[PDB]
Amino acid sequence: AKLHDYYKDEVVKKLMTEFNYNSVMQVPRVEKITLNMGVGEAIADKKLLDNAAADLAAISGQKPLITKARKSVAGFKIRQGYPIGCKVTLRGERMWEFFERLITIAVPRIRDFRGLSAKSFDGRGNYSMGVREQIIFPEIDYDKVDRVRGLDITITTTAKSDEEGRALLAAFDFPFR
Amino acid sequence: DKKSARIRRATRARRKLQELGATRLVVHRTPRHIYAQVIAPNGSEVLVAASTVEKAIAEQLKYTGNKDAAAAVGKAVAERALEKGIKDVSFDRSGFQYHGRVQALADAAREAGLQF
Amino acid sequence: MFTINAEVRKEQGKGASRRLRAANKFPAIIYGGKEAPLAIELDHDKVMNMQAKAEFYSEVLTIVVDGKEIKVKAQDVQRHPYKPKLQHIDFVRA
Amino acid sequence: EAKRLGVKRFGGESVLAGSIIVRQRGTKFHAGANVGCGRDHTLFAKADGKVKFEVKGPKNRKFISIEAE
RNA sequence: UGCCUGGCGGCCGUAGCGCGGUGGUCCCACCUGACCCCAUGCCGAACUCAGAAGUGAAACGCCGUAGCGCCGAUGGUAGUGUGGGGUCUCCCCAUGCGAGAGUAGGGAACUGCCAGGCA
RNA sequence: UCCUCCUAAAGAGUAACGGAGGAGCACGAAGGUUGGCUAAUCCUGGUCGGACAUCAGGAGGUUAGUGCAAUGGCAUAAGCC
RNA sequence: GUUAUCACGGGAGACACACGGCGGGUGCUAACGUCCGUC
């Protein structure tokens, strides 16, 4: 709400002006956000998975859900039905506030800030990257940090092309590649 | 898609009722409007039908779509079926979830004098 | 410029085909357009001599049947598996 | 032992209630009207009438039906 | 009753797939939270409540494209039931049933009932 | 002893000391009901990753799985919650 | 077509078939070797 109002006030206007769209909702509309943890070392120990899930729940407004094995391979010695990681599916006020808090401080402050990639898209305009050093986030404090860990962040949107993703990045002002 | 999933879910009871071969009352629901009909065993003829979009039954309803509207539609369908002589139809909720307007209209039809 | 001759087809079936092949002849068919397809009878040695030419692959055949001249083109020629005999030809009224 | 397989009764022939039409290893045929499928994937009649075969469905699967005389 | 939309059946690649166009008159679809109807292997994940605040946009109805794909003759060919012959590993003679494949052709399907809208 | 494909010739049955194989198991859940979901494989991004832990998106549409050797079937699922 | 069809009662015989024709399997797509379904 707090960020959605501004998004509709300014982002939609500029997007429509630049893309000469006709339908009011032709502008891209965010569907959801996904924050997943796919470290894969959960086989060695199971407590780290629970600790990371609790940390994700604390930083977000809802608890993550665990994901079971998809397909087993003899090379990596992984069975079926054994949980490895978990994901948080942010929708609504929770996703809005989480994304606002991220973009406010977290993204600017990161070591080796080379810049996000505007071309690394799945193919239909869904931006799904991975970020390490979870300490960058403000919620994760040294009193609870356990080990340098990474996560996968995706913004699922109704768009079906990379041009819409580029326009969304431009609206977010896209500091630099 | 939502309509395809709903149709596939309803297909279970739709095919199961073919073996029974008895007239069945079905209701399609939408936040805007609600439709209802009583299909014959052949599956191609309906003995009675109604729709919330129709003013003839929406005159006393504040709007076509609401719990009171669904209850009134169910009561009207039950009364019309009883006066026509449907002879103990079966029920099918078109693959919906039996907790809201569908439940209200089913209860209304049951209390109208039906035995399904 | 190429002379051709044909005979009316009045028989039908594998029996007729065997009769023709025993009598040293074989049938052919002409199809295409709105006119109904029709079967015609041709001999064997003369047809082989005609086909010996290398221009048949692009020449328009002038069939002479029942005192009528018809311009056609051969598209399919069913040839015997190994023996040097022909048993069926297909023409289109181009 | 050689397990018995095949179509016990063909189309256009009369069958009574509970009569098996075809005892198939799998489900090469599907019951239609007045035909039921047992636990052994066997099609059995439920009424008295003539048997018939038909082909339909997205995969052109075969159906066995019964029409009362 | 001319046209559009949704549901209830038939048929099951002529209804299938790719591309362009069009659509809010009705209908359909996107939307907030939900302590309340309903409940989540967390999530309103699926389904429900206030309707248009706004639109025809994923999707969805329809038209063109015969592009991919599908159905498909007559005839011919392989095969085969009966009687006989030959140089009897196989072929032919008289006769009946007839392939697959391919060509012409077909077609962007069609049909019965209910409901709403522009007339 | 039982069971699976040919032989066994477009109905069924159909043999040689013919050519090819598994079993003497197994549940108080791996059964039933009801409410739901739906496959291997490749591609994009991916400190751990070597192509081959899993992860967000696309194609695929049962070549997966369907406890055993094998055969017929299973998407409406007979596969899973 | 003389009911040439089926059903019950009593009496049987055999319970070691060869050759040829038609479509096949084993055999080395060596066969006229060998075993099958039918006349």
Residue numbers in the entry:
A (entry chain F): 1 to 177
B (entry chain O): 2 to 117
C (entry chain V): 1 to 94
D (entry chain W): 13 to 81
Paper text:
The proline-rich antimicrobial designer peptide Api137 inhibits protein expression in bacteria by binding simultaneously to the ribosomal polypeptide exit tunnel and the release factor (RF), depleting the cellular RF pool and leading to ribosomal arrest at stop codons. Separation of cellular extracts derived from cells exposed to Api137 in a sucrose gradient reveals elevated levels of partially assembled and not fully matured precursors of the 50S subunit (pre-50S). High-resolution structures obtained by cryogenic electron microscopy demonstrate that a large proportion of pre-50S states are missing up to five proteins (uL22, bL32, uL29, bL23, and uL16) and have misfolded helices in 23S rRNA domain IV. These data suggest a second mechanism for Api137, wherein it disrupts 50S subunit assembly by inducing the formation of misfolded precursor particles potentially incapable of evolving into active ribosomes, suggesting a bactericidal mechanism.
Based on these structural distinctions, we categorized the 11 Api137 specific states into four groups representing different stages of maturation, five of which lacked cryo-EM density for the CP, while six had docked the 5S rRNA, with the CP accordingly formed. Importantly, the absence of uL22 was consistently observed in most identified precursors (states: 1-8), implying a systematic effect of Api137 on ribosome assembly. The absence of uL22 and bL32 in several states of the Api137 dataset also led to the absence of uL2 in eight precursor states (states 1-8), suggesting a possible role of uL2 as a checkpoint protein, whose binding completes a construction phase.
